[PDB]
């Protein structure tokens, strides 16, 4: 009874199908759920957390805590570069193994805004100024302190603030075609008698709320 007609696709196993299946243990009442703290609904809750960037990824110190410390030297060098990098999460070595980088490497297309925080870890007696500069994608990195001043920049006085924040708006993926960030000595570091001479800066990266990902794929790390 009930005349019926089989269509193409019958009796195939499609690895991504979605069908009701027969239970092998129907007479078994399951343990009820517990209210465990710390539940997750979405992977973007992991990428919105700050993590420390290994900005000092040069030879001889890829296996020490020193990889995370930007060196600030003593004396008068008030126009020299402190650091610089291209902003390319997912592809570039300095951003590749962070919490944000590890997520982005599961997807073939992504886009959003990024947040960078810088923190000064010197003694409370040290004072000085840094110049933090941002170049957009398609622009060359500045070569001097003066042309970095002629673009988008902030002047950061560490005797007043211990930390600075930046939000970068046009991030996508695929000799890069990406924006960059650089830091310059505006003045030099000045200390009283009896304080350590050298010091360090640390970088933290995170994602802002408008971040999106597409086309789940396999990661290239295991």
Partner 1 sequence: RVRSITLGNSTITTQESANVVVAYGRWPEYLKDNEATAEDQPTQPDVATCRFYTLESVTWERDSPGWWWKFPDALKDMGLFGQNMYYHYLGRAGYTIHVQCNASKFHQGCLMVVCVPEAEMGCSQVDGTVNEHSLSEGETAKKFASTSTNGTNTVQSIVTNAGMGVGVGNLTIFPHQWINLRTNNCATIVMPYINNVPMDNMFRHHNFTLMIIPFVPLDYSSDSSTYVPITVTVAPMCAEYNGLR
Partner 2 sequence: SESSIENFLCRSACVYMGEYHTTNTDTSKLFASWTINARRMVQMRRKLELFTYVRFDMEVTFVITSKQDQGTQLGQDMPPLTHQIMYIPPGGPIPKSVTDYTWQTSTNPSIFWTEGNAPPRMSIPFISIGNAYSNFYDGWSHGVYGYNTLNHMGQIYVRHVNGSSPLPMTSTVRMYFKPKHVKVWVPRPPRLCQYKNASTVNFTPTNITEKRQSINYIPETV
Closest to partner 2 by CB, 2 vs 21, is 21
Give long-range contacts, CB 8 A cutoff, 24+ apart: 214-219: 214/107, 214/108, 214/109, 214/110, 215/107, 215/108, 215/109, 216/106, 216/107, 217/106, 217/107, 217/108, 219/102, 219/105, 219/106
Q: Residues 179 to 208: which contact partner 1 by CB under 8 A?
A: 194-200, 202, 208
Question: Interface with a second copy includes 40 (CB under 8 A)?
Answer: no
User: Judged by CB under 8 A, which of 1, 22, 75, 194 binds partner 2?
Assistant: 22
By CB under 8 A, residue 8 contacts a second copy = yes
By the 8 A CB rule, do 92 and 85 touch? yes
Q: Please state the closest distance from residue 106 (CB atom) to a second copy, in A.
A: 12
Q: How far is residue 1 CA from its own chain's centroid?
A: 63
How many C-beta atoms lie closer than 10 Å to residue 185's C-beta?
Answer: 20
Residue 220, SS3? coil
Residue 204 CB coordination number (10 Å): 17
The answer to whether residue 163 forms part of the interface with partner 1 (CB under 8 A) is yes
- CB 111, min distance to a second copy, A: 10
Q: Is 174 in the site for a second copy (CB under 8 A)?
A: no
Q: How far is CA 146 from CA 170, 195, 219, in A?
A: 25, 31, 42
Quick one: which of 80, 108, 157, 190 contacts partner 1 (CB under 8 A)? 157
Q: What, of a second copy, partner 2, partner 1, none, does residue 140 touch, CB below 5 to 8 Å by kind?
A: partner 2
Which listed option, partner 2, a second copy, partner 1, none, makes contact with residue 69 (CB within 5 to 8 Å by class)? Answer: partner 1
Helix (H, G, I), strand (E, B) or coil at 133: strand
Q: Which is nearer to partner 2, 97 or 159 (CB)?
A: 97
Q: Which is nearer to a second copy, 9 or 138 (CB)?
A: 9
Residues that bind a second copy (CB under 8 A): 1-14, 16-19, 21-29, 125, 212, 214-216
């Amino acid at each position: 009874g009930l005349p019926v007609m089989n269509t193409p696709g019958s009796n195939q196993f499609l690895t991504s199908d979605d069908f009701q299946s027969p239970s092998a243990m129907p007479q078994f009442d399951v343990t009820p759920e517990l209210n465990i703290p710390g539940e997750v609904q979405n992977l973007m809750e992991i990428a919105e957390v700050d993590s420390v960037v290994p900005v000092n990824n040069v030879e001889g110190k890829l296996d020490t805590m020193e990889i995370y410390r930007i060196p600030v030297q003593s004396g008068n060098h008030q126009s020299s570069q402190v650091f610089g990098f291209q902003v390319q999460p997912g592809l570039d070595n300095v951003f590749k193994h962070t919490l944000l980088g590890e997520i982005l490497n599961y997807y073939a297309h992504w886009s959003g805004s990024i947040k960078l925080t810088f923190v000064f870890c010197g003694s409370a007696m040290a004072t000085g100024k840094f110049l933090l500069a941002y170049a957009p994608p398609g622009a060359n990195a500045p070569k001097s302190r003066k042309d970095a001043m002629l673009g988008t920049h902030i002047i950061w006085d560490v005797g007043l603030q211990s930390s600075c924040v930046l939000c970068i708006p046009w991030i996508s993926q695929t000799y890069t075609s990406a924006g960059n960030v650089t830091c310059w000595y505006q003045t030099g570091i000045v200390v009283p008698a009896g304080t350590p001479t050298s010091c360090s800066i640390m970088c933290f990266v995170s994602a802002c709320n408008d971040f999106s990902v597409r086309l789940l794929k396999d990661t290239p790390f295991i």
